[PDB]
Amino acid sequence: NLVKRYVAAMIRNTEENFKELKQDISSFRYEVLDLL
Amino acid sequence: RIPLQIVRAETELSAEEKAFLNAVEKGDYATVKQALQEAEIYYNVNINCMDPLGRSALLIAIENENLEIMELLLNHSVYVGDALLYAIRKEVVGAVELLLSYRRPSGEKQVPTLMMDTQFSEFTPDITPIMLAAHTNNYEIIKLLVQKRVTIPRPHQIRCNCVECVSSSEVDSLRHSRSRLNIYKALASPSLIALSSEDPILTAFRLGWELKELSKVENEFKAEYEELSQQCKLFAKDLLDQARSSRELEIILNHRDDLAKLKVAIKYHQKEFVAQPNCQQLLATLWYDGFPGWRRKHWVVKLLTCMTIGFLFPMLSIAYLISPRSNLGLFIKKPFIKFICHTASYLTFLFMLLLASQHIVRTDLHVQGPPPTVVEWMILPWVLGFIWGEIKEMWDGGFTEYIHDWWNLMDFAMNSLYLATISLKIVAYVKYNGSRPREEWEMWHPTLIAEALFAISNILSSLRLISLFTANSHLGPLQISLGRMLLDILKFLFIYCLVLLAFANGLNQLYFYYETRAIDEPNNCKGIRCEKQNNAFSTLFETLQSLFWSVFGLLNLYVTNVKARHEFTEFVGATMFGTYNVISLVVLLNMLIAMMNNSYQLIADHADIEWKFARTKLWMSYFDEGGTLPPPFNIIPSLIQNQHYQEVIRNLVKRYVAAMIRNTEENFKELKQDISSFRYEVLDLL
Amino acid sequence: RIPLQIVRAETELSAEEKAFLNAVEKGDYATVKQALQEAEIYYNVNINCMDPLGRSALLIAIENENLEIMELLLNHSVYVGDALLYAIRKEVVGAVELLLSYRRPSGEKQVPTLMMDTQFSEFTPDITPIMLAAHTNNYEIIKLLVQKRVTIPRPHQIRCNCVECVSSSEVDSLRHSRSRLNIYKALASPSLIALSSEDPILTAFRLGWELKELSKVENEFKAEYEELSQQCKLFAKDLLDQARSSRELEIILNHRDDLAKLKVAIKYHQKEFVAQPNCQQLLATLWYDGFPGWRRKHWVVKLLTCMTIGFLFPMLSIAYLISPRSNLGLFIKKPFIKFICHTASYLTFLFMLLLASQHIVRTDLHVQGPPPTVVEWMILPWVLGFIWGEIKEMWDGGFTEYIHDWWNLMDFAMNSLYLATISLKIVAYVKYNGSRPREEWEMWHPTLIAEALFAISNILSSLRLISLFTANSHLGPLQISLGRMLLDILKFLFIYCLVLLAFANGLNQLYFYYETRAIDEPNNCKGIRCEKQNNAFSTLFETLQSLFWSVFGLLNLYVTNVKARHEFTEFVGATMFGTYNVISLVVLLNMLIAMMNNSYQLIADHADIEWKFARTKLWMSYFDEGGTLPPPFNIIPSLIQNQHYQEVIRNLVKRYVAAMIRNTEENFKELKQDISSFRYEVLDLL
Ligand SMILES: CC(C)CCC[C@@H](C)[C@H]1CC[C@H]2[C@@H]3CC=C4C[C@@H](OC(=O)CCC(=O)O)CC[C@]4(C)[C@H]3CC[C@]12C
Ligand SMILES: CC(C)CCC[C@@H](C)[C@H]1CC[C@H]2[C@@H]3CC=C4C[C@@H](OC(=O)CCC(=O)O)CC[C@]4(C)[C@H]3CC[C@]12C
Ligand SMILES: [Ca+2]
Ligand SMILES: [Ca+2]
Ligand SMILES: [Zn+2]
Ligand SMILES: [Zn+2]
């Protein structure tokens, strides 16, 4: 029980991240243009 | 090598359940809807299935803030246990609204039966949703919970000795401590105080005092109780800071259950509330009641006015006695004139004590019981006025408040010394008639004891002037740091007294066989106070005095030498004295320097606030009419207020809520979730 | 009231130009394309129009990273001046590629003529694109610029006295300083050093040394030159840290133009490069050459081996003399045995100097010129060996390197003292024959002067042991902090010497009339070194000695009293002495304590690195074969390396580039721009 609670606590508690959002927006933009 | 295995069994999720949880994580509404519609007909997927990290489908919907997937999972009657706690901790208003509003409609046939999902809960089982919402400090969720008729349990007294508190502490102390800390954390939130208290300032003051007392009592949980008290004090100061007019500030300060709320804040030690700039401006305006534009003036005219009003001490007090309703008698009732007159009276008393120690007045010292000189006859009314003022301060305000000042101990000591010297003088006058010369007087002569007590009282009277340093703008924080470093000096002096007692015991036990009489030694003296330093380690008192005086270097090195040629005993005593000198001059004093240095750095940031608090405490001591006369002259023989306070607190609470609303990897996950959900819906529609 | 007006005329943008700039800002491609297509036919909008903030349409396209709008604005032949600088500062690889590649094709009829756009440039006119790319530290843009045959101007020497440097400094010093700082900032980038230098470590070392010397010279721009030197040193340490094998580390350290590169790093004061952990491990392995697993052992066996090898000092040096190729003679060539033998020899010399001051050897003190005792006859070979070792150290390494150690000054002083005492002893032996008693000797007797110089040399020899503190792991940073605080003590002692000279001048000028002869005073002595303290302010030297001794409290208070009853002069002198005591004991010493306290806090963070640098400098002093014998016994009569270094530096540069690539409101504006451009294109298509 202590290990489960500690794992929940540690899960609960940068330029790579924004690149994901640019990548997700760019991939959605190309697929929308390709389908349309 | 080392084999590695999963020690604790986590059941693996099936392919359909893993695909369903992945679809819920990616926010694909159509696939999740298809899986939910296929779940009832075929029973393939347990909708309440968990993940490796302990989240269910509903918790994954709550964490990503997908309201559509949240309501869709709610429409198929998934397990909903403790999801409101996760929504409240996530501070999502829409999720809390959905979980509050959907639990009531369309409940049919109990709930569908489910087993073995309920072991893992991130939130503690003692927690309730209103308490966790109070801990989160979110306003909208607290408001929505308070609208639905929700209550919180009342904590007991800290010194509670009833059967149920003692039984809960004995059976499970950890659960009781966690429940009390959670309840006080819920009660200390600014939003709950603003929403569920008709007097937020007084409630914040009482909660801060109770949290400080609990931190003083509970040793294990001191830090979070101190944090809660600081949060309550900052909430009170922030609510006071939101005022917009002088009338609102005077309505807030003068509200009663003149400045009653300021006195209540001072009684609860709310330094941030007292040291706010607008309250300081109002106290400065009240302090300079009869002197408008005091801050404007060049310092020469201010000092000239101070000199001319301090030199006019013997008038303006008899004028108050003879005509209190006259124009001249009304100027003494202002606080600045009262403080200047009291300072002038104390300076006159100090100057008279300086003048009493001169050869112009003192004559014929060879009288056993001397009559009091005219300087003493005039000084006696000041001592009587000080006695009457101290006893009046003991009566008014109560005996429980007279002892908390900590300056009254010196006043009690000074009054005791004056009473002792007066009694010794009167007894020496009454029954020591004669003119015997002073060289053959008894060592226990009451005249000498009376003069020694008079000198000690004169030292205490001259050292009483440190308390006036709060009035200046430069000597206040200096004495605040001095007060903290005095406590650190006491903490040092305990260990120093222990080391001094140990070394004095050793030195006396070694050296008390070689004691010599005063007749054998030169000049008929015995001690460390001779021209030639005599036996310094012959007695315990003499050893203590000699070890005390060695710190300042006033004790020579030949005190460890004996008459006989006992070289080993002399070397052992010299080693003892050297070890004591090395300790008390290389370790202890430098450690005291290091301790008071560290303390000053901590003290400086807070030095102003406490200086302003001390100056406010000194200023309101002169506001009342009790004690208008100086020490030389004090012995000479309504619901509209509550409605306005409620209006001002209402506007202040609205402004503070607007200010606090105006003033991480979870966030970007929302943007990935919003982009992913929009991408799936665009692909599905197209 | 106060009127407010636009003091400096910014021309207002028209409606069409403002709409066009707003459309370019929002990323709407179709509206911008329509406006550009309508611009030529109707001439309505100046495409090179500016904004209120100084950006054009092309700069707005570059800042939002809209490559489509960027190429569309390029296709209509807009002004392109200095846009490559904005692209390089924005670190956009695609924008730099587009601006490099589009400037060449389709240039027809010069450029279209445009006026009055060219005044406002954020980048300075001296700047060039390769230099700004070097300042930005981006790798891809630097690579693309270097591929197109681009060069950078060479900075001159710091001590340059040519006509053009002096003329540029006299005509415009600010432009010259900015150009030199920009050039050195371009040359100090890690990417340019990795791309355009065949030896990045040596280039970084030379650039760091040049930047440190420029920071020492240029007073105005010290901080950025120190930052550039720190950046070069950190680049060198980071490139050294990327190694993966011991062979690569030994190839890097042993590369020449044995450990040549380590010596070059020590010569350039690269403390971070020397104090790297792998180089420290290699130096520890070389240091414990014959003792494998030295760190493994319990401390008793290590101390026993140290005692048995230090007590075996007189053997293992004659063994090296008689059989250097034997098994026993080869053990002295290891560095640890060399250091232990030298420490044992110096400890033996110190113990012999202690033994020379005993009554067992010294006999018949009433001889004028005494022959040297047998202890002195044996001590003389150690002094000769020290002289030969110091002169050998002067010859080998050069006179320009012998003076930078700062420990050689004490060795020079010790050798001078030994030569002076030997010359005084030999002259006293040769021409002072007799047995006159010591009580009637001349004050300038060479025997007494020789003994005083011998005592001072003995003090210097005993205080020479501080330099061995680098060998231990606990006494190294302590003496590093001691070395910094000694410089701070010198900075204090300058002001103390000035104050002491002033007060000594005043005291001597006041008190030198009351000088008395030695015959009149008791015991025939004159000075502060009597039982009764004589005239202490009679001469300048005596006044200086008395004011020096008053700091430690060894000067009594009755030295300011004169024979006659001149109360005013005595009071003035007492006030003078009291003011000097208050200064030198209340202000100066406490200020020195505060200064050395602050210094220690700064010193502690860097204390290890410099301790490791000092220990590395001490360790490699014993690596060479010059000075194998102790002081008592030293007077007894290839392109594959470059190819491997290039391979290792190649792999290190690739690993460092990968590491640096692996390790704000502009960013969110990209996401708003990408979402806005996608929204307009979806609306346009639909
Ligand atoms: C320096 C030597 C000669 C000893 C002096 C002893 C006393 C004559 C001093 C010690 C503390 C002094 C007091 C420190 C601070 C103030 C407050 C000062 O007024 C303010 O700071 C204005 C603001 C306010 O208090 O309302 C007026 C003088 C007074 C009473 C001073 C009067 C003179 C005092 C009693
Ligand atoms: C404490 C009193 C009695 C004075 C002692 C004076 C000397 C006998 C001391 C002063 C400094 C000492 C030295 C300080 C440090 C070292 C390094 C130490 O070796 C290490 O620290 C191991 C690592 C290495 O140096 O390679 C061996 C002893 C030695 C030479 C010490 C030998 C004894 C020394 C010369
Ligand atoms: Ca009182
Ligand atoms: Ca040397
Ligand atoms: Zn109870
Ligand atoms: Zn030049």
What's the B482 CA to ligand 1 centre distance in angstroms? 18
Map residue B566 onto helix, strand or coil.
coil
- Nearest-CA neighbor of B428 among B367, B373, B365, B366? B367
d(CA C102, CA C99): 6
Q: Render C500-568 in DSSP notation, one character per residue.
A: HHHHHHHHHHHHGGG---TTTSGGG--SSSSSS---SSSSHHHHHHHHHHTTTT-S-SGGG--SS--HH
Q: CB–CB of C355/C375 below 8 Å?
A: yes
d(CA B221, CA B228): 11
User: Taking the CB of residue B202, how many other CB atoms lie within 10 A of it?
Assistant: 17
d(CA C672, CA A22): 10
A-B C-beta contacts closer than 8 Å: 37
Backbone angles phi, psi at B295, to 5 degrees: -70, -20
Residue C77's identity, in one-letter code, is S
Residue recorded with tokens 């432009």: C175
d(CA B110, CA B254): 58
- Nearest-CA neighbor of B98 among B76, B66, B121? B66
At what resolution in Å was this solved? 3.9
The gap from C-alpha C471 to its chain's centroid, in whole angstroms, comes to 21
Neighbours of ion ligand 5 (CB under 5 A): B 156, 160, 162, 165
Tokens (6 digits) for C5: 């007006």
What's the A22 CA to ligand 2 centre distance in angstroms? 63
- H-state helical runs in C553-664: 567-582, 588-621, 639-662
Tell me if A33 and C681 make a contact (CB, 8 A cut-off).
yes
d(CA B415, CA C210): 76
Residues 6+ apart with CB under 8 A from B149: none
CA torsion angle for B499, B505, B511, B512 (degrees, to 10)? 150
Q: CB–CB of B73/B47 below 8 Å?
A: yes
> Which experimental approach was used here?
cryo-EM
> CB under 8 Å, gap of 24 or more: what pairs does B11-17 form?
B13/B49, B13/B51, B13/B52, B14/B45, B16/B44, B16/B45, B17/B45, B17/B46, B17/B49
Q: Which helix (H) or strand (E) holds B571?
A: helix B567-582
Integer CA distances (angstroms), B176 to B156, B169, B186, B376, C659, in order = 11, 6, 15, 66, 52
B609-646 burial, b at 16+ Cβ within 10 Å, e below that, comes to: bbbbbbbbebbbebbeeebbbbbbbbbeeeeeeeebbe
Tokens (6 digits) for C52: 């209120």
Q: Render B130-176 in DSSP notation, one character per residue.
A: HHHHHHHT-HHHHHHHHTT----PPP--TT---HHHHHHHHH-HHHH
Q: CB–CB of C87/C46 below 8 Å?
A: no
DSSP letter, residue C12: P
Integer CA distances (angstroms), B135 to B142, B193, B200, B662, in order = 10, 12, 18, 20
C168-178 burial, b at 16+ Cβ within 10 Å, e below that, comes to: beeeeeeebee
> CB under 8 Å, gap of 24 or more: what pairs does B67-71 form?
B67/B94, B67/B95, B67/B98, B68/B29, B68/B677, B69/B24, B69/B27, B69/B29, B69/B32, B70/B95, B70/B98, B71/B98, B71/B102
Q: CB–CB of C304/C242 below 8 Å?
A: no
User: Searching chain C, which residue's CA lies closest to the CA of residue A29?
Assistant: C678
Residues 6+ apart with CB under 8 A from B372: B380, B425, B429
Map residue C308 onto helix, strand or coil.
helix
Angle between helices B260-267 and B246-253 (to 10 degrees): 60
> Which among C667, C675, C681 has the least Cβ separation from residue A25?
C675
Residue C111's identity, in one-letter code, is V
d(CA B44, CA B35): 9
d(CA C613, CA C268): 12
d(CA C70, CA C56): 12
Q: CB–CB of C547/C500 below 8 Å?
A: yes
Q: CB–CB of B641/B255 below 8 Å?
A: yes
Q: CB–CB of B86/B122 below 8 Å?
A: yes
Say which ligand is closest to the CA of B466. 1
Kindly tell me the sign of the dihedral angle through the C-alpha atoms of B334, B337, B340, B342. negative
Residue C15's identity, in one-letter code, is A
> Which among C667, C674, C686 has the least Cβ separation from residue A25?
C674
Burial-class residue C71 by CB neighbours within 10 Å (0-12, 13-18, 19+): middle
CA angle centred on B298, ends B294 and B303, rounded to 5°: 75
Residue recorded with tokens 């924004």: A18
H, E, C per residue of C154-200: CCCCCCCCCHHHHHHHHHCHHHHHHHHHHHHHHHCCHHHHHHHCCCH
- Nearest-CA neighbor of C197 among C268, C142, C148? C142
Q: Render B273-288 in DSSP notation, one character per residue.
A: HHT-HHHHHHHHHHHT
Residue recorded with tokens 């979402």: C675
What's the B290 CA to ligand 3 centre distance in angstroms? 26
Burial-class residue C669 by CB neighbours within 10 Å (0-12, 13-18, 19+): middle
Integer CA distances (angstroms), B109 to B71, B106, B112, B113, C381, in order = 20, 10, 7, 10, 110
Map residue C481 onto helix, strand or coil.
helix
Q: CB–CB of B118/B97 below 8 Å?
A: no
> Which among C678, C681, C685 has the least Cβ separation from residue A25?
C678
- Nearest-CA neighbor of B228 among B127, B152, B159, B135? B135
CA torsion angle for B536, B537, B541, B547 (degrees, to 10)? 70
- Nearest-CA neighbor of C530 among C560, C554, C507? C554
The gap from C-alpha B424 to its chain's centroid, in whole angstroms, comes to 43
Tell me if A32 and C667 make a contact (CB, 8 A cut-off).
no
Largest CA distance in chain C: 125
The gap from C-alpha C645 to its chain's centroid, in whole angstroms, comes to 28
d(CA B440, CA B170): 73
- Nearest-CA neighbor of C19 among C10, C11, C6, C28? C28
Residues 6+ apart with CB under 8 A from C29: C68, C69, C72, C677, C680, C681, C684
Question: CB-side exposure of B455: number of CA atoms within 13 Å?
Answer: 6
Which residue in C138, C667, C675 has the most chain A C-beta atoms within 10 A of its own C-beta, making it the best mutation to test that interface? Answer: C667
B525-544 burial, b at 16+ Cβ within 10 Å, e below that, comes to: ebbbeeeebbbbbbbeebbb
Rg (CA), chain B: 38
Q: CB–CB of B321/B633 below 8 Å?
A: yes
d(CA B248, CA B254): 10
Kindly tell me the sign of the dihedral angle through the C-alpha atoms of B79, B81, B83, B86. negative
How many helices (H) and strands (E) are present in chain C, helices listed first? 30, 0
Write out chain A residues lying below 8 Å of B27, CB-based. Answer: none
Tokens (6 digits) for C276: 């790297």
d(CA C537, CA C515): 8
- Nearest-CA neighbor of C190 among C656, C658, C655? C656
- H-state helical runs in C188-334: 190-196, 200-217, 222-241, 246-253, 260-267, 271-274, 277-287, 299-310, 318-322
Residue recorded with tokens 């070097």: C134
Angle between helices B639-662 and B200-217 (to 10 degrees): 70
In angstroms, the separation between the Cα of residue A22 and the nearest Cα of chain C is 7
Tokens (6 digits) for C3: 């009127």
Backbone angles phi, psi at C165, to 5 degrees: -65, -40
Kindly tell me the sign of the dihedral angle through the C-alpha atoms of C261, C264, C268, C271. positive
- Indicate if ligand 2 lies below 6 Å from the C-beta of C472: yes
d(CA B650, CA B644): 10
- Nearest-CA neighbor of B454 among B423, B433, B483, B490? B423
Q: CB–CB of C671/A15 below 8 Å?
A: no
CA torsion angle for B232, B234, B237, B241 (degrees, to 10)? -130
Map residue C436 onto helix, strand or coil.
coil
Q: CB–CB of C281/C240 below 8 Å?
A: no
Residue in C283, C337, C341, C468 to alter for ligand 2 test, most ligand atoms within 8 A of Cβ: C468
Residue recorded with tokens 């040394």: C209
Residue recorded with tokens 């005599």: B534
d(CA B460, CA B454): 10
Residue in C334, C339, C465, C619 to alter for ligand 2 test, most ligand atoms within 8 A of Cβ: C465
CA angle centred on C647, ends C646 and C649, rounded to 5°: 65
User: Taking the CB of residue C575, how many other CB atoms lie within 10 A of it?
Assistant: 11
d(CA B346, CA B471): 15
Tokens (6 digits) for B196: 């569920």
The gap from C-alpha C144 to its chain's centroid, in whole angstroms, comes to 36
Map residue B654 onto helix, strand or coil.
helix
C427-439 burial, b at 16+ Cβ within 10 Å, e below that, comes to: ebbeeeeeeeeee
- What superfamily does domain C15-285 belong to in CATH? Ankyrin repeat-containing domain (1.25.40.20)
d(CA B260, CA B240): 15
Which residue in C93, C665, C679, C682 has the most chain A C-beta atoms within 10 A of its own C-beta, making it the best mutation to test that interface? Answer: C682
Integer CA distances (angstroms), C621 to B590, C135, C205, C299, in order = 40, 40, 22, 26
d(CA B226, CA B211): 7
Residue B566's identity, in one-letter code, is H
CA torsion angle for C14, C15, C16, C19 (degrees, to 10)? 120
Q: CB–CB of C662/C277 below 8 Å?
A: no
In angstroms, the separation between the Cα of residue A27 and the nearest Cα of chain B is 10
